[PDB]
Amino acid sequence: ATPTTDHDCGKAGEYQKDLETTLASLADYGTIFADGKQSKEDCAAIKKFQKRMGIQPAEGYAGKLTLDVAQRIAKSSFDKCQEAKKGKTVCVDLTHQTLWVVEDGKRIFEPTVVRTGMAGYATQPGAWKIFVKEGTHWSKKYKVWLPYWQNFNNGEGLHTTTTYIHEPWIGSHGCVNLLPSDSKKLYEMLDFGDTVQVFGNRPGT
Amino acid sequence: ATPTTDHDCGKAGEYQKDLETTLASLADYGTIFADGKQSKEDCAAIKKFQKRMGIQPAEGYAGKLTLDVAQRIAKSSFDKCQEAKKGKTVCVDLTHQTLWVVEDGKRIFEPTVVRTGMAGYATQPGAWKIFVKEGTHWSKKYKVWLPYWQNFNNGEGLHTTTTYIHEPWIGSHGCVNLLPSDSKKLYEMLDFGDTVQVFGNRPGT
Amino acid sequence: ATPTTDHDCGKAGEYQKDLETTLASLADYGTIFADGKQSKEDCAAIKKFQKRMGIQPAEGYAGKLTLDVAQRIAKSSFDKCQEAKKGKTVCVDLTHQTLWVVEDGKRIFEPTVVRTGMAGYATQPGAWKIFVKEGTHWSKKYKVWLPYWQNFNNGEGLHTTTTYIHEPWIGSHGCVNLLPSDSKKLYEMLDFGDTVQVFGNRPGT
């Protein structure tokens, strides 16, 4: 009913108010008091969001990264993703660096964070079908193991990120990097022939 | 109780009567009126069968291919498949170009369509154990990705067909081609060491 | 309530009494009468244990191997396995040649038998994270397919044993050999980044 002002998290960060508002509109992170003040409830909501989106540490602090990610998730361009006729469509919003999945006109996987091709390695827009799935793929070019590999376009694929996903300057080299939990879930959910619909443009690419 | 004569399918094809009879004996495609006349019920049954057996389009037309497939399924040589002592036995009837699975004296996977080796590439008869499973196998010989690969004999394996399975002249080159739904299901069901029992002979090979 | 003295198993083996006692303490193999006499109940318990631990044949005979395996399972060094902070920890007790799994301070996979590196090929002790998973791995060094491959240290990995696991002189060459049932279960249970904690020393290595 009312905020618990005694909590074990930091004093409210600069973006507390805007983050609270954004998370409340997402409507999946529990009780939120949109007042710009940190509370036990707001801290729990922020930590839950941070854990889900792989923000490390998940310490409840309403920092710039956490607000930026929350806004990207909230602004995911649902109306810009062309759904394929058959199977599922993996919607890859390059502009917001988010991903969701649709089947038969309904979202079956809610937006999550991704990291796509950095400057010089931009992920090619288009409609691409998954044609290779490997539990772990050895990249001959990059000399690295890529978990939960799903190739959709000439070696551009979905896979578990091998570096911290929120560092924009170290990846990707064309692939769609995913958090471990999301990559595993998508590996189980998606079929051969499902469409990866890549649209927009990653800022700075 | 009685056929619905008003339907959105074509006027009955030449093999309507025989197809209705065959599907009724299969006893898994719903209400059928074995009268040689197309109805809403018979059309639904035929479409369901066509979808299950990967006949494209599944438009409810009692054509030659659909009857031929239905008869192959119905005539699957259950008594010609030697069951292995341990694990499951994948029964590959080369004569009828069908496949089913038995375990502990009972069928756990009902007959489905396959395409095995064409003339010059006939699939070798015998009792063969699955010893390699790959989510996707790259064939070095044929330069193609083969989904849900299960190798049982020197590179002759189960996998998802890469071309329309009902075209007899374009495959296989020795492997047992399967429909996508069936290949995935068999990949999940079958274990290392399960026996692939290949018998009969593909007509024209 | 009382032993059924009429059974279809052999006259009691030399280690009947000690095996009965060990299996009773394991407390998962049903009714046991710890009297040194074979019975229908004791035979059933011994066969169940033999089947679970891949002792072939599982004929209910209280032989040396069966007692040795039972004692290894019972003496598994639970307090010697350092649990990792994140994910699951696969505890590999080289001294007892057994394996179990812990998560959040609790065992989620009870001890089973393994075979690790033989003399000259001893499995390296330490804390190692699973970084490659393959349904079947082709060993270039040993020219063999290894099912349910989970690489944790420079090609030392978990996989299904390719030879009878209870023959100490024919393996392994560094890997942790597992029974088929256990390897499949661990392949499904374990994640990338789970820790393989290898400790102790295989006797004679």
DSSP notation for chain C: -------SSPSPPTTHHHHHHHHHHHT-S-----SS---HHHHHHHHHHHHHTT-SS------HHHHHHHHHHHT--GGG-PPPSSS-EEEEETTTTEEEEEETTEEEEEEEEEE---TTSPPPPEEEE--EEEEEEEETTTTEEEEEEEEEETTEEEEE-SS-TT-GGG--SSSEEE-HHHHHHHHHH--TT-EEEEES--TT-
> Pick from C64, C154, C114: which is nearest to A145 by CA?
C154
The two three-digit tokens of residue C75, written as one number: 């003496």
The two three-digit tokens of residue B142, written as one number: 């044929």
The two three-digit tokens of residue B196, written as one number: 């692939």
Q: Is residue B141 domain-shared with residue B177, that is, in the same domain?
A: yes
Phi first, then psi: give them for residue B188, nearest 5 degrees.
-75, -35
Q: Where are the beta strands (DSSP E) in B62-170?
A: 89-93, 98-103, 106-115, 126-129, 132-139, 144-153, 156-160
CA-based end-to-end distance of chain C: 46
Bridge partner list, A159:
A177
> Pick from C131, C71, C125: which is nearest to C96 by CA?
C71
Question: Who contacts A141 (Cβ-Cβ below 8 Å, separation ≥6)?
Answer: A155, A173
Instruction: State how far the Cα of C187 lies from the Cα of C184, in Å rounded to an integer.
Output: 5
Chain C residues near residue A180 by CB distance under 8 angstroms: 191-193
- The residue type found at B197 is Q
Backbone CA torsion sign across B178, B183, B185, B189: positive
- Whether the Cβ atoms of residue A100 and residue A107 lie closer than 8 Å to each other: yes
List, edge to edge, every strand of the sheet that includes B195-199: B126-129, B195-199, B89-93, B98-103, B106-115, B176-178, B156-160, B144-153, B132-139
User: Is A175 a residue of the active site?
Assistant: yes
State the smallest CA–CA distance between residue A193 and chain B in angstroms.
10
Domain that holds residue C65: 1-76
> Pick from C34, C41, C189: which is nearest to C103 by CA?
C189
Q: Is residue A105 domain-shared with residue A202, that is, in the same domain?
A: yes
Q: Give the SS3 label for residue A183.
A: helix
Angle formed by the axes of helices B16-26 and B40-52, nearest 10°: 70
**Ramachandran region of residue C105, left (φ > 0), alpha (ψ -120 to 50) or beta?**
left
Chain A residues near residue C134 by CB distance under 8 angstroms: 135-136
> Pick from C183, C145, C140, C189: which is nearest to C165 by CA?
C183
Instruction: State how far the Cα of A81 lies from the Cα of A111, in Å rounded to an integer.
Output: 12
The two three-digit tokens of residue B160, written as one number: 């998802």
Phi first, then psi: give them for residue C15, nearest 5 degrees.
-105, 20
Backbone CA torsion sign across B102, B103, B104, B110: negative
Tally Cβ neighbours within 10 Å of residue C66: 24
B133, B191, B193 ranked by CB distance to C136: nearest: B133
Q: Is residue A81 domain-shared with residue A31, that is, in the same domain?
A: no
- Going by the DSSP 8-state scheme, the letter that residue B202 receives in this structure is -
Instruction: State how far the Cα of B17 lies from the Cα of B34, in Å rounded to an integer.
Output: 6
- Going by the DSSP 8-state scheme, the letter that residue A80 receives in this structure is G
Q: Is residue B84 domain-shared with residue B65, that is, in the same domain?
A: no
Element containing residue A156 per DSSP (H, E):
strand A156-160
Instruction: State how far the Cα of B26 lies from the Cα of C117, in Å rounded to an integer.
Output: 54
The burial class, CB within 10 Å (0-12 / 13-18 / 19+), for B75 is middle
Q: Is residue B69 domain-shared with residue B84, that is, in the same domain?
A: no
Residue owning tokens 């046991």: C32
Integer CA distances (angstroms), C31 to A43, C25, C44, C64, C192, in order: 53, 12, 9, 22, 40
CA-based end-to-end distance of chain A: 46
Bridge partner list, C72:
none
The two three-digit tokens of residue A134, written as one number: 């490997």
> Pick from B169, B37, B189: which is nearest to B112 by CA?
B189
Phi first, then psi: give them for residue A67, nearest 5 degrees.
-65, -45
Chain C residues near residue B133 by CB distance under 8 angstroms: 135-136, 147
Q: Is residue A54 domain-shared with residue A72, that is, in the same domain?
A: yes
Contact B184 A193 (CB under 8 A): no
- Whether the Cβ atoms of residue A162 and residue A146 lie closer than 8 Å to each other: yes
- Whether the Cβ atoms of residue C186 and residue C204 lie closer than 8 Å to each other: no
Phi first, then psi: give them for residue B156, nearest 5 degrees.
-85, 120
Q: What is the resolution of this structure in A?
A: 2.0
> Pick from A48, A50, A36, A51: which is nearest to A3 by CA?
A36
Angle made by CA atoms A107, A110, A111, in degrees to the nearest 5: 120
- Whether the Cβ atoms of residue C136 and residue C150 lie closer than 8 Å to each other: no
Q: Looking at A58, A76, A94, which one is the last position of a domain?
A: A76
Instruction: State how far the Cα of A94 lies from the Cα of A199, in Å rounded to an integer.
Output: 6
Q: What is the bridge-based pairing of β-strands B89-93 and B195-199?
A: parallel
CA-based end-to-end distance of chain B: 46
- Please indicate the experimental technique that yielded this structure: X-ray
Q: Is residue C26 domain-shared with residue C85, that is, in the same domain?
A: no
Instruction: State how far the Cα of C87 lies from the Cα of B110, in Å rounded to an integer.
Output: 40
Q: Which of B7, B91, B159, B173 is catalytic?
A: B159
Q: Is residue C85 domain-shared with residue C71, that is, in the same domain?
A: no
Within chain A, how many helices (H) and strands (E) appear?
Answer: 4, 9
Phi first, then psi: give them for residue C52, nearest 5 degrees.
-65, -40
Q: Is residue C130 domain-shared with residue C200, that is, in the same domain?
A: yes
Phi first, then psi: give them for residue A25, nearest 5 degrees.
-70, -30
- Whether the Cβ atoms of residue B197 and residue B89 lie closer than 8 Å to each other: yes
Backbone CA torsion sign across A128, A129, A131, A134: positive
State the smallest CA–CA distance between residue B135 and chain A in angstroms.
6
| Nearest residue in chain A measured CA to CA from B162 | A131
> Pick from A73, A90, A72: which is nearest to A81 by CA?
A90
Residue owning tokens 């063969």: B128
Bridge partner list, C200:
none
Rg for chain C, CA atoms, rounded: 18
Q: Looking at A21, A51, A76, which one is the last position of a domain?
A: A76
| Nearest residue in chain C measured CA to CA from B187 | C135
Q: Give the SS3 label for residue A200.
A: coil
- Going by the DSSP 8-state scheme, the letter that residue B193 receives in this structure is T
Bridge partner list, A106:
A103
- Whether the Cβ atoms of residue A129 and residue A197 lie closer than 8 Å to each other: no
State the smallest CA–CA distance between residue B140 and chain C in angstroms.
15
Element containing residue B39 per DSSP (H, E):
none
A135, A147, A184 ranked by CB distance to C135: nearest: A135
Q: Is residue A21 domain-shared with residue A62, that is, in the same domain?
A: yes
Question: Who contacts A48 (Cβ-Cβ below 8 Å, separation ≥6)?
Answer: A29, A30
- Whether the Cβ atoms of residue C104 and residue C117 lie closer than 8 Å to each other: no
Looking from the CA of B110 toward its CB, the CA atoms found within 13 Å total 9
Which chains share 3+ C-beta pairs under 8 angstroms with B? A, C
State the smallest CA–CA distance between residue A135 and chain C in angstroms.
6
Angle made by CA atoms A123, A126, A132, in degrees to the nearest 5: 75
Element containing residue A205 per DSSP (H, E):
none
Integer CA distances (angstroms), A105 to A29, A113, A129, B111, B192, in order: 25, 22, 18, 33, 39
Integer CA distances (angstroms), A43 to A3, A31, B82, B166, C202, in order: 11, 10, 64, 59, 49
- The residue type found at A20 is E
The two three-digit tokens of residue A87, written as one number: 């199977």
Domains identified in chain C, total number = 2
Q: Which of A9, A159, A166, A173 is catalytic?
A: A159
Instruction: State how far the Cα of C191 lies from the Cα of C195, in Å rounded to an integer.
Output: 9
Preceding amide of C181 cis, omega within 30: no
Q: Give the SS3 label for residue B106.
A: strand
B136, B160, B184 ranked by CB distance to A132: nearest: B136
Q: Is residue C92 domain-shared with residue C169, that is, in the same domain?
A: yes
Q: Is residue A188 domain-shared with residue A101, that is, in the same domain?
A: yes
Question: Who contacts C185 (Cβ-Cβ below 8 Å, separation ≥6)?
Answer: C109
**Helix/strand/coil percentages in chain B, nearest 5:** 25, 25, 50
Angle formed by the axes of helices C64-74 and C40-52, nearest 10°: 70
- Going by the DSSP 8-state scheme, the letter that residue A36 receives in this structure is S
Q: Looking at C9, C44, C76, which one is the last position of a domain?
A: C76
